[PDB]
Amino acid sequence: MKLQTTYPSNNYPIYVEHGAIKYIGTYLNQFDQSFLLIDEYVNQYFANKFDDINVHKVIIPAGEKTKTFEQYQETLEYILSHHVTRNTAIIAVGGGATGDFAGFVAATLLRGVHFIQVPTTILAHDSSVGGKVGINSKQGKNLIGAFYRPTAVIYDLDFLKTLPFKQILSGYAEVYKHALLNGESATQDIEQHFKDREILQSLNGMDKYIAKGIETKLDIVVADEKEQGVRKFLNLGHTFGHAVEYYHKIPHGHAVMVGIIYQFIVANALFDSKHDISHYIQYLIQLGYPLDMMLSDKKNDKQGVQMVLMRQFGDIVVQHVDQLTLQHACEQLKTY
Ligand SMILES: NC(=O)c1ccc[n+]([C@@H]2O[C@H](COP(=O)([O-])OP(=O)(O)OC[C@H]3O[C@@H](n4cnc5c(N)ncnc54)[C@H](O)[C@@H]3O)[C@@H](O)[C@H]2O)c1
Ligand SMILES: O=C(O)[C@]1(O)C[C@H](CP(=O)(O)O)[C@@H](O)[C@H](O)C1
Numbered sequence: 645m646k647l648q649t650t651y652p653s654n655n656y657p658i659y660v661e662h663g664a665i666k667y668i669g670t671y672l673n674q675f676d677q678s679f680l681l682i683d684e685y686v687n688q689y690f691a692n693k694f695d696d697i698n699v700h701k702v703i704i705p706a707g708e709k710t711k712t713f714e715q716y717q718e719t720l721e722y723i724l725s726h727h728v729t730r731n732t733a734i735i736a737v738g739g740g741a742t743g744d745f746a747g748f749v750a751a752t753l754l755r756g757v758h759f760i761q762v763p764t765t766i767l768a769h770d771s772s773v774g775g776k777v778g779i780n781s782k783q784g785k786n787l788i789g790a791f792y793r794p795t796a797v798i799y800d801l802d803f804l805k806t807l808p809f810k811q812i813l814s815g816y817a818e819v820y821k822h823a824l825l826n827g828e829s830a831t832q833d834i835e836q837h838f839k840d841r842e843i844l845q846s847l848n849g850m851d852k853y854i855a856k857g858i859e860t861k862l863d864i865v866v867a868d869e870k871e872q873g874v875r876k877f878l879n880l881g882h883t884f885g886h887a888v889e890y891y892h893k894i895p896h897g898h899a900v901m902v903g904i905i906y907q908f909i910v911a912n913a914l915f916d917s918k919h920d921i922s923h924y925i926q927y928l929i930q931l932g933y934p935l936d937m938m939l940s941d942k943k944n945d946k947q948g949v950q951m952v953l954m955r956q957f958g959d960i961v962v963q964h965v966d967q968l969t970l971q972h973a974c975e976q977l978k979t980y
């Protein structure tokens with residue numbers, strides 16, 4: 645299984661399969677040099693699997709810790725003291741935090757070097773695609789960054805077999821977000837597969853759902869690349885997610901999910917949609933999600949918050965929302 649971009653020119657591949665880590669050599673030795681940027685923890689996890697392969701490993705901080713200015717500068721400089729060249733490659737081995745970061749590096753190093761994505765998490769089935777590199781600020785989630793099409797995406801599904809539930813739940817939220825953006829057909833289909841923590845935690849049939857969630861996006865991104873129209877949809881529930889996250893430091897997905905319900909709550913308070921909140925709540929409980937726990941966003945336009953609201957499957961929209969509505973929802977949600 646392989647997917648590829650559809651843009652007019654400068655298109656990259658997305659090898660999605662078990663053992664795709666093999667596809668990596670086929671490029672590597674066609675570069676002057678190559679820097680391996682890898683998660684501190686992830687490096688532990690698979691340090692050996694890479695020995696099997698003009699290559700300098702660069703171990704970076706674990707997760708979100710790596711996405712800071714401080715860390716961007718330090719790295720670059722290091723990578724610079726190697727009299728590098730435009731034909732050099734940056735290889736992101738890890739979660740979206742590793743890619744988002746490394747990529748930014750690869751996007752700026754000498755105005756643009758080669759970028760290779762070796763996503764290792766479930767959530768990375770979204771982060772590895774689109775080329776939305778960038779880092780964090782003291783003002784929020786990724787305010788500094790860029791769009792930089794990766795040279796290619798190597799998604800070796802074997803990486804996943806070692807993900808704590810905490811990270812499985814995190815990532816799935818995206819696989820699920822994508823299902824949601826495919827109308828009912830995919831939503832209630834996926835719901836009927838991963839209907840409980842047991843089945844989920846087992847990773848059984850995740851191959852199927854990830855592959856689609858990606859393709860789903862693959863179409864949106866290949867279309868509205870610079871997020872001018874539809875790419876704005878992918879920000880489903882992040883309006884509230886991105887917030888609750890950077891403000892509760894829970895795993896990305898956890899906040900997304902939450903925000904994803906919030907969105908619905910607000911859909912009802914606006915278009916009086918027939919959203920069965922209680923249904924989505926039991927879904928998160930049955931799935932095993934925790935369940936005990938905004939003015940600066942990217943879709944925002946000077947006037948107030950802009951949310952990606954679903955009025956019904958196959959009918960997503962974006963628009964302002966008075967803090968008024970944002971209350972009853974973030975209060976109706978408090979009744980849980
Ligand atoms: N389009 C985009 O650029 C985009 C899309 C989605 C989300 N994101 C970004 O993605 C990040 C969230 O993704 P994430 O969950 O992958 O982040 P992450 O890098 O923090 O990974 C989660 C944790 O799991 C560890 N880990 C990674 N691979 C593992 C594996 N295979 N087995 C076990 N442990 C592993 C990491 O060390 C980390 O502690 C955020 O920084 C978010 O802003 C960006
Ligand atoms: O266009 C995308 O790929 C996203 O909207 C990009 C966002 C990141 P942003 O809102 O910081 O651009 C990501 O969290 C979301 O899951 C998908």
Ligand SMILES: [Zn+2]
Binds near residue numbers: 818882896900
């Ligand atoms: Zn996200």
